[PDB]
Amino acid sequence: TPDIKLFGKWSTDDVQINDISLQDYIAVKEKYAKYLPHSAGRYAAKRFRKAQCPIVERLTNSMMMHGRNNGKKLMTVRIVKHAFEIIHLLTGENPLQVLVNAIINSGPREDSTRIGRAGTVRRQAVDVSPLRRVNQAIWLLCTGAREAAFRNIKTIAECLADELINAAKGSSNSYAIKKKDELERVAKSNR
Amino acid sequence: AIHRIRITLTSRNVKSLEKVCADLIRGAKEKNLKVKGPVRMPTKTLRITTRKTPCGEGSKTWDRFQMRIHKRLIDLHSPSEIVKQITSISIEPGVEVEVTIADA
């Protein structure tokens, strides 16, 4: 443990952080070697505290939405650590590294901001932040988890693991691959 | 013979309560009794929620008044008569001072 700290049941090591912009917004083993994702119970104290929070801890944060599910991280970290188990038995890979790849293919490249042109709808081909690229990755990952479980035999962990695996390698069966591309569609589009 | 007399002090004015509790502890040692000290019982916050707007069409304006009373006791291993004799004299205003035969 003082040599290397791993995940609660997985390894923070053997994690392939393989994007260009998303360096040091995705870290699980670099400074963020955590068996237990919980920093202090707040993550909006600073704008800096976004990159302080790792993607494994923000996933436990960005899940508890939907007011009956708000204020429940203990249900969440249960279901989140359940979801890593459902990754590995479907993959065999490090389920953190699957989650780490899930941020990669779900992060956009160019998006669009609104602009006006002659009354007609045009949108400006802009980059988004690699902070936002992670935040557009996680939020689309967190959307398909509770939604697909909401009237199905599958729990959120089974839907979130399918959400991570199909976004670890873009299969267009996770919600995050399917909605990133519509964001990236408008950049090469209008004007 | 000594007689462990509680001196219970109740007030709402703290520095009035403090300047009298200073008189009781010193005056018990000025003319010799037990001196024990301020056993700080917690204050009681009397909070009452009121309406700020009578005939309250418009905005629901709530108004809360608090009143804080302050308790403490001073148990004195000291001879029963001259416990209450030295202490209860010379303090009329501002502060209730309750010397007490109990905790015998």
């Binding site: 068996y35 237990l36 202090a40 119970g41 203990l74 | 629901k60 709530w62 809360r64």
Partner: protein
């Protein structure tokens, strides 16, 4: 009698006092180890600094802790801040500045702030709204 230091670890309303008494004993949070009460979902949090410091620092003392206040989660940091501070305060007065500093050096790179108090409490509630910052549902024409 045996040598000891008393400390505290604090969340919003949660003070856990551990006496890090000399001898051979556990980290007895309310007389029992941490495999008890069952929150046991933040269980890697409170078990983390003992692994990073070694149990022999905590087993060269008896640590019996009195804990009160808060909820289940508020007490988990309250005991983790305390027994971290118990180990610092034991070596600093009795044994050595160097080990407790190394204990302070080990605790602080992941930085759960296990040695400083935290000013976060519940914010005082004002009227005119069902929430501490949120207000009622408004109606206009």
């Amino acid at each position: 009698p045996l040598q000891s230091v008393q400390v505290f670890g604090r969340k919003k309303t949660a003070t856990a006092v551990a006496h890090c008494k000399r001898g051979n004993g556990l980290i007895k949070v309310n007389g029992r180890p941490l495999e008890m009460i069952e929150p046991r979902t933040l269980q890697y949090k409170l078990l983390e600094p003992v692994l990073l410091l070694g149990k022999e620092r905590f087993a060269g003392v008896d640590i019996r802790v009195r804990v009160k206040g808060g909820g289940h989660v508020a007490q988990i940091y309250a005991i983790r801040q305390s027994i971290s501070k118990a180990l610092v305060a034991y070596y600093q007065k009795y044994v050595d500045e160097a080990s407790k500093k190394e204990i302070k050096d080990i605790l602080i790179q992941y930085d759960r702030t296990l040695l400083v108090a935290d000013p976060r409490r519940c914010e005082s509630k004002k009227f005119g709204g069902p929430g501490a910052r949120a207000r009622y549902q408004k109606s206009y024409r």
